[PDB]
Every structure is written in C-alpha cells, then in structure tokens.
C-alpha cells in the first residue's frame, strides 16, 4: 500500500471517530439551550453525517457556540477526508496513465 491509499484509509477511520465524538459533544453542548433540537444521540449522529457530507438538509442544526464549534470540526473533517480520497484517486489514475504511456 502506497502513501495516498494509506492517508485515505486513515482519513476514513478518523472521520468515523469525528462523527461519533461529534455526536456526543453536540448533545452535551446543545442541552441546556432552550429550543435546541440537537439533543438526543441517534439523531445527533444523523446530523453529524449530513454535516460531514455537506448535505445539510436543515432538519437539525446547533444553536450554541460550542455546538457550532463542534459542527465546524465535523465539516472540516468531512471536507478534508473526501478531499483526501479525491487526491488519492487522482494519484492512482496518474500513475496508471504513466504506465499506459510507457513512461
């Protein structure tokens, strides 16, 4: 296994950790704030996923400072992970095209 496929795997594992920790911390941050909906773990996890994927339906979102800071970490982890996968795919294709051209 080369570097790019290693970093991609690591980013995927790390993303899973961020989703789980993010769901836990979001509930912890949002409870205590009147009107907050991000307050139970199952839907918090669903919120984490759609935050990391950038979909953001808007059915759930943080209203507190720390809940929003947690969200930012989830967003960045998502953008970085999927960005790291795209870069890895590009490296794979560049290398294969390099061999195909006999260089």
């Amino acid at each position, epitope marked *: 296994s080369a570097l790019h496929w290693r970093a991609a795997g690591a980013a995927t594992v790390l993303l899973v950790i961020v989703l789980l920790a993010g769901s*836990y911390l979001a509930v*912890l941050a*949002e*409870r205590g704030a*009147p*009107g*907050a909906q991000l307050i*139970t773990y*199952p839907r918090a996890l669903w919120w984490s996923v759609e935050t990391a994927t950038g979909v953001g339906y808007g059915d759930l979102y943080p209203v507190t400072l720390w809940g929003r800071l947690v969200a930012v970490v989830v967003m960045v982890a998502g953008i970085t992970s999927f960005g790291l996968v795209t870069a890895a795919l590009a490296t794979w294709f560049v290398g294969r095209e390099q061999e195909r051209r006999g260089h």
Partner: antibody
Amino acid sequence: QVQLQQPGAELVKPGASVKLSCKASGYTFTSDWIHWVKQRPGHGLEWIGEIIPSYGRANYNEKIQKKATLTADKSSSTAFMQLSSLTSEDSAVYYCARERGDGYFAVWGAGTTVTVSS
Amino acid sequence: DILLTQSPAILSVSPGERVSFSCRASQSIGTDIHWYQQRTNGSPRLLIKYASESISGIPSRFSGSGSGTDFTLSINSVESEDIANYYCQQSNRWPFTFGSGTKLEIKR
C-alpha cells in the same frame, strides 16, 4: 433488579438543606442521563434538571427557581441532588429517572418524600 | 418552551370500552412524544415511546398514534388496573416537558 434506588423520606427544617441520593445499577453507558422530577401531592410531574455522569455537566429548568444542585459519583454509580434553603413549597416527592440519551425515561426511582417542617 | 395540553383532565369510561387520551403540543414535534402511567402512590411507568412504539412488558391493549402536534394514547377495553394518571412528555426540544395529566375513571 431495581435499577434506581432512592431513600424513602427526608425531614428538613425550614431554611435547612438536604442532599438526596440515587444509586443506579444495571447497564450503564456513557450516554446515560440522570433526571430529577418533582411531584407535589395532587399535582403533576415537574422536571427539575438533568446530569450526565460521564462528563459531569448539569442543566436545570429555567422556568422555576433553582433550589437544586446536581452532582454524580462514577465510582459508586450514584447521583445526588442538593436542595438548599427549603420552604414548605419544596415539600414533595422527588423522583430520579434514567434516560439512555434517546429522550424517554425508561426507568424511575421509587421516589423520596421530602417534608419541610419544624 | 414546548407546552403539552392534556384535555380532558378526567375521563370516565365503562368497563371493556375503548378510551383515548389526547396530548396537544404548542408546536410541531414530529413523533417525539412519550406516555407514562402513574397509579395511586406509585412511580411513573413508561407505556409508549415515540408516539406509537410499544414497550416490553406493557399489555397489547395499550397503543399510541399521531404526529406533529396531535397525539393520542388508546386503551382497547379498559379494565380496573388501568385506573391511574396518564402523562405525556416531549423530547423534541430542550427542555423536556410534561403534560398536565389525565385521570382515568371507570363507571362500574
């Protein structure tokens, strides 16, 4: 086995303070919240506050005067509620309940009847 | 905060008859409502979670329905042990809140 164990009763003098206990058993998770509910005779259920033992953070009902302070001990799996400066208005049954972080109170304690009197 | 209205406060029914408790939320809360039973001198007891999901150990005659703002707890053929107070509770928005409660009476 009884998941939540509370003392039967507590007698408190007007102005004094009392710490109610709630010893938990059964399955315990990091996502567990312990809630406290106040019920006056003839009246309904009134939410007081919550605490997450795995982190120690507590939240309280903003609609009522804060006379409670929630703490927890992970070593003995026991939740505590510190009621301070009590009047006859504070005389009620105080239940503790366990929520698995999914919104509902799966199990309740037997309740601690608190009487404020001289 | 979310207000839960339970009306009527008292429901009189004949034995074996179907009864329905109503719970109305001050705003839309999907299906995040839960039902509890409290008999005389007893502690509350979970009957239905998430509006309609049954609980292990609870008789099949207990059921729930509704979504949004209007929720209903139903009892098929009320018997004597069903005499109690019935509370609804929401978990959609912080803080959790309880309804005022409905008492069930049996006309024997």
